[PDB]
């Protein structure tokens, strides 16, 4: 018998309670998967399911001291994990999932199938999901003003629609998105539309994460950053003078695995996954202490150019060259963003971007031409070729230009070959950089005899 | 009698309930020794078990209260500790235990034997556990486009499929395996692949182990890689710079040692099980804090040398001698990778390399002549020769060569040290081995003091 | 039993010091792994420490526990391939 | 009891020092080999601890505790063969 273990079973069989393998238990409360340590959750679910059970049960169900009972029944059945967070298509909203590539929405059972542990919170209304109202067209013109929709700004537009896209695809990115432009362009609006968007999906944390050492000890920071679809991080502390901490290469690399190592206060757990789209605001270049191709590959950049600025400056707008139109700021928007006034249309918007760029892999991409830095590692590896084993044949070409052979190897002076990459870079304006590519590459051939196997690609061309 | 006395004594007659020296209480359920110090299992097994027992007995173990006492009077019978996790040659999934040295799959009672407390935490299906599919074509490909099977990469790729298949071993492997090479080569494959194959046998840690203090204070990256077969804590900090805390060579010494001391904080323990092989996927080539020769013998490399670009920059790769080869990318291939395809065939392969090099007994081997940072003393030890008494009988010779006859000995001034170094390699390049050399190996000869007894090797050679 | 190198490099009482309180009634104690103090960029091995060893008890206590006096019946014994420093 | 120089040359009550609540109701704290500071390097004898553990009261607080108030009795004795030195 046992009426208790009876009303347990029931509750085992509706499938409702399950065990992760976090060792945490989710229940399944309001068409939503819940989930909380501190406040378990297993008593609401057998209050709230208590209408499923027959008459005899659940008249049973309504002393604390007896849904107790039935709880330890329930823990104690439970054996097997599974595994959480599987399907990086569906946004899971506070009463349901809405699927990105069919369109439909489900609600009850028909989300239950897909264990979505970290919803945005707020409930899906499917009046305000339309293409036609007042409210998708001021945001249609406000995102035409932040971007706008010339011919020289195509790319960099649809660079700006493909970050703000990935927002709702639960995958891990490989790339992190530099927003980069000079006061009052627009960034901080697009941060509070997206949070309006996506709701509790969107995390912004400080800069430490991009400076400090991940693991060092206790780093929430970082620890928060488990399963958030959009990590935002704002004021880029500009590096033009001294005393600032530059930002690490190693840092970028680490924030690009699908699994970011770090733990909060009074944890253990070491492991979060990643499926953030880290978006970095900034008005200012970023400085890097070690560039690579590691790095190279990992960066990209969107530009703001407009200024939205009230009267009293306009004509102090209208002579500068880092804009490109200057439009009158307005005092109300802030209030109505802040009201979420344009979350459905946003929403709306940012589903019809998903469709648009999901071909059928979605690749962030990167853009490292756009970046002051990268442009020096760069043109060195479009002027400077290495020689190979193929150029043996024209080893007296090489002899007669000026270079040196040495074990089939083609070397050349190390003031020659400075004075012959200083041709055509600034030994001045990189110095630094040009005595670390020159002493890190620097491999002898002969006894002593510092050199570098690299000659000019134009030199090799010409005969 | 007391009937759930007489229950708990039948559910520990069937040794199902183990204490650990640790203090852990391991219980076997559905064919696996799990253990947990956060929800004690005891009454989980209490109620899975009741099955078993006789009619009268079974319905007495419904209710909450009673199996809680089952529960102390099982945990007031164990008074004696079992040694757990001594076989090496297992491999233990979530539903058996494979013999790794026949390849038969044991499961249930004949799987009970062997106290395996750890497990990969995935079933095990013998149809996909098959040497010819199309999964294992793939597979087979891709490794032989990582690493190629040409003549010249033969002693790399033996190197490489030994420390990925010493991942199944559970004793304590006597090296470190550093997984360096240039960026986009193959190292996260690598890395993915053997995660979706060994499954929870298998995690990630920071740099904090390799970096900071291993004893310090409390520090949870080292409380995971307990029992663990693979650790794999990646993304060194760039030492090209030169501008970041060393690899502490402490730390490695501490590292390949049958226990490794951490987590003093609290859940009792201080000491943990060194059964990994710990790989470091580097960038670039390692800085030590002091170099010895107990470090020479502790560290390892694999070389990827093999590019992914893509089309648009595979002519700059092309020209490239980071690569001996480019090919390229394929999108969607981390996708089905991380999706768990590939996991029985490398499983398969690993066994099969796990039987190819395993001799008599397996011994992982370091490569030190690779690290350019470990050059200058092996170079001292191919450059310097110490005073040798049958070498006395050269008194013409040693005339002729200029040495100071001392103490029975051969000695040369500071200032010819000095020259003799200058000649033996570069003196910018050298200064300081030259330096911490002579402190290190200065005796009581020459003027006064700070003399190094030990001539040059071919001036040692020579008569 | 084998303890990490805390024992030496650091104040004896400090906080929870469950290195010192496994050493309660041992008798051999062996610590490895000794940093090479020639290259300047370690911390010596204080002379308090080495005098404190030699007491007959000791202070120090695990964690989640009131007992703090451990008695030092322990050989100590440092496997070091270089030779050690002192303050 | 016997106490090292401990309280010698750091702050009396700064953090949580052992021997300011071993000072409780003991009769007598020795000192021994003080660390001569004739020559240079070796810290002066704080004055502000010879001139604090003079007073009838001590004022320390041990790690995870709260009672900081203790009754002092001890007579403090130093022996060493270097003469004191303090700045
Ligand atoms: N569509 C718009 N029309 C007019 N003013 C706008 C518009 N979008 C933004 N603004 C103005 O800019 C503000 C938001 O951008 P702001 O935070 O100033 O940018 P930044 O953080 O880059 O300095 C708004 O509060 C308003 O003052
Ligand atoms: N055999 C292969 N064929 C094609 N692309 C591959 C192959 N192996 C890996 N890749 C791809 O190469 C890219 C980079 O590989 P990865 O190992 O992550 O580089 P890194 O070693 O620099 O971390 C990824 O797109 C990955 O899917």
């Keep these: 018998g046992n009426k208790l273990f009876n009303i347990a079973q029931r509750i085992l069989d509706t499938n409702s309670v399950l065990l992760t393998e976090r060792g945490d238990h989710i229940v399944w409360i309001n068409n939503s998967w819940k989930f909380n340590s501190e406040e378990p959750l297993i008593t609401k679910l057998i209050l709230s399911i208590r209408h499923q059970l027959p008459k005899e049960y659940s008249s049973e169900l309504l002393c604390p001291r007896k849904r107790k009972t039935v709880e330890a029944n329930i823990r104690d059945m439970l054996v097997d994990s599974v595994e959480t967070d599987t399907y990086p298509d569906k946004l899971p909203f506070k009463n349901g999932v809405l699927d990105l590539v069919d369109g439909m929405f489900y609600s009850g059972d028909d989300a239950k199938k897909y264990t979505c542990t970290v919803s945005t919170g707020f409930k899906f209304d499917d009046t305000k999901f339309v293409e036609d109202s007042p409210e998708m067209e001021?945001?249609?013109?406000?995102?035409?003003?932040?971007?706008?929709?010339?011919?020289?700004?195509?790319?960099?537009?649809?660079?700006?629609?493909?970050?703000?896209?990935?927002?709702?695809?639960?995958?891990?990115?490989?790339?992190?998105?530099?927003?980069?432009?000079?006061?009052?362009?627009?960034?901080?609006?697009?941060?509070?539309?997206?949070?309006?968007?996506?709701?509790?999906?969107?995390?912004?944390?400080?800069?430490?994460?991009?400076?400090?050492?991940?693991?060092?000890?206790?780093?929430?920071?970082?620890?928060?950053?488990?399963?958030?679809?959009?990590?935002?991080?704002?004021?880029?502390?500009?590096?033009?003078?001294?005393?600032?901490?530059?930002?690490?290469?190693?840092?970028?690399?680490?924030?690009?695995?699908?699994?970011?190592?770090?733990?909060?206060?009074?944890?253990?757990?070491?492991?979060?996954?990643?499926?953030?789209?880290?978006?970095?605001?900034?008005?200012?270049?970023?400085?890097?202490?070690?560039?690579?191709?590691?790095?190279?590959?990992?960066?990209?950049?969107?530009?703001?150019?407009?200024?939205?600025?009230?009267?009293?400056?306009?004509?102090?707008?209208?002579?500068?060259?880092?804009?490109?139109?200057?439009?009158?700021?307005?005092?109300?928007?802030?209030?109505?963003?802040?009201?979420?006034?344009?979350?459905?249309?946003?929403?709306?918007?940012?589903?019809?971007?998903?469709?648009?760029?999901?071909?059928?892999?979605?690749?962030?991409?990167?853009?490292?031409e756009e970046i002051p830095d990268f442009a020096f590692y760069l043109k060195i590896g479009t002027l400077l070729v290495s020689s190979s084993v193929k150029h043996i044949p024209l080893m007296t070409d090489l002899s007669k230009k000026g270079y040196i052979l040495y074990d089939n190897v083609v070397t050349l002076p190390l003031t020659t070959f400075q004075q012959k990459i200083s041709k055509y870079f600034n030994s001045r304006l990189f110095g630094h950089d040009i005595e670390s590519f020159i002493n890190r590459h620097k491999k002898f051939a002969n006894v002593s005899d510092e050199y570098l196997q690299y000659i000019f690609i134009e030199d090799i061309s010409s005969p």
Excluded at 148 to 163: A, C, F, M, V
Excluded at 220 to 233: D, E, G, T, Y
Excluded at 252 to 268: A, D, M, Q, W, Y
Excluded at 342 to 356: C, G, I, P
Aim: one cysteine or more.
């Design 138 to 368: 001021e945001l249609m013109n406000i995102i035409n003003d932040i971007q706008p929709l010339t011919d020289e700004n195509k790319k960099n537009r649809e660079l700006y629609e493909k970050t703000l896209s990935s927002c709702l695809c639960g995958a891990t990115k490989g790339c992190l998105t530099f927003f980069f432009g000079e006061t009052a362009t627009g960034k901080s609006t697009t941060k509070r539309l997206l949070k309006s968007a996506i709701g509790d999906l969107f995390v912004e944390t400080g800069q430490t994460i991009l400076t400090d050492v991940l693991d060092k000890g206790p780093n929430p920071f970082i620890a928060n950053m488990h399963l958030k679809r959009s990590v935002f991080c704002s004021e880029l502390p500009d590096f033009a003078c001294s005393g600032s901490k530059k930002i690490r290469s190693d840092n970028i690399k680490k924030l690009t695995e699908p699994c970011v190592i770090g733990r909060p206060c009074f944890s253990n757990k070491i492991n979060n996954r990643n499926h953030a789209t880290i978006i970095i605001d900034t008005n200012y270049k970023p400085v890097f202490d070690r560039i690579d191709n590691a790095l190279m590959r990992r960066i990209a950049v969107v530009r703001f150019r407009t200024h939205f600025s009230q009267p009293s400056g306009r004509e102090a707008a209208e002579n500068n060259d880092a804009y490109d139109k200057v439009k009158l700021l307005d005092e109300g928007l802030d209030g109505k963003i802040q009201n979420n006034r344009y979350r459905f249309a946003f929403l709306y918007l940012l589903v019809k971007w998903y469709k648009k760029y999901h071909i059928p892999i979605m690749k962030l991409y990167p853009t490292p």
